[model samples]
Target chain A: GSRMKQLEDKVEELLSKNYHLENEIARIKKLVGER
Target chain B: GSRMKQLEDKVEELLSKNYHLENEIARIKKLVGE
Candidate 1:
């Protein structure tokens, strides 16, 4: 179903964003928190 | 693409998780940094 296809695409974007944010979050956490 | 549809549905789930994590991250970022 073409309708469903849009969902897959959108989800991927979110997934990608999540991955980037999580990684970025990790780096910042240590630099800001870890001592 | 039909395959892409699943992604849209999951977007909701990811968004919720993302929102929660984002705020938590935001809080900590400010707490220990700026």
Candidate 2:
């Protein structure tokens, strides 16, 4: 089950990264006016 | 096996989104100045 858990962990990490990146992108998008 | 496969798929999808988001973040950081 380690492999499966590894997959689980990777998903969690990536999701967190994605969330932070999404928020950051949104802020920058507003700054750039979505151009 | 379906659950394992599903886990595999989510990882793939999340990795892809993460990659794209990282690149986009880099570009925006350059725009805003790191």
Candidate 3:
């Protein structure tokens, strides 16, 4: 149970990071368009 | 603030779902190998 839980936690963290990065990319794209 | 909060909530929800799907994919891969 603990092992699966740990893996799930890591997956959750990475997913959150990936989503935020995508959001940042979108934000940067808008800024780039303004230039 | 509300709009940003809504976006953040959706991001969190999607991330949780994405991670679970990845785990399921890995599980399926192992089953396929077997």
Candidate 4:
């Protein structure tokens, strides 16, 4: 099983990336509103 | 989004590995039998 890195890691990495991306988007929206 | 086969992919991949294991076991048994 090895935690099936090929798929699990790929998805985990993707979701994590999405999380950071969303966070950045939120920050950008706040910055634009402040300006 | 529909290709979201996390659970299904795991199941399918597991089953495939299981199938290979079964075949290997059968071959081992054959060796023992012979």
Instruction: Go through the candidates in order and give each one's C-alpha lDDT.
Output: 0.74, 0.79, 0.61, 0.56
Tens digits of per-residue lDDT for model 3, B1-34? 6754655665688767667656655554564463
Backbone N/Cα/C clashes per model: 10, 0, 0, 0
On residues A3-33, what C-alpha lDDT tens digit does candidate 4 reach at each position? Answer: 5556676655655655565565556445544
lDDT of 3 by residue, A1-35 (tens): 67755656665677677667666555644554434
Against the true structure, candidate 3 reaches a TM-score of 0.46
Best by DockQ: 2
Supply the DockQ value of model 1.
0.52
lDDT tens readout by residue for model 1, B1-34: 4654555556777788888887888887787674
TM-score (second chain) of model 4: 0.71
Model 2 RMSD, rounded to 1 decimal: 3.1
Where in model 3 is the C-alpha error above 4 Å?
Answer: B1-34
Relative to the real complex, the DockQ score for model 4 comes to 0.01
Ranking by DockQ: 2, 1, 3, 4
**Better model by lDDT, 1 or 2?**
2
Between 2 and 3, whose DockQ is larger? 2
Ranking by TM-score: 1, 2, 3, 4
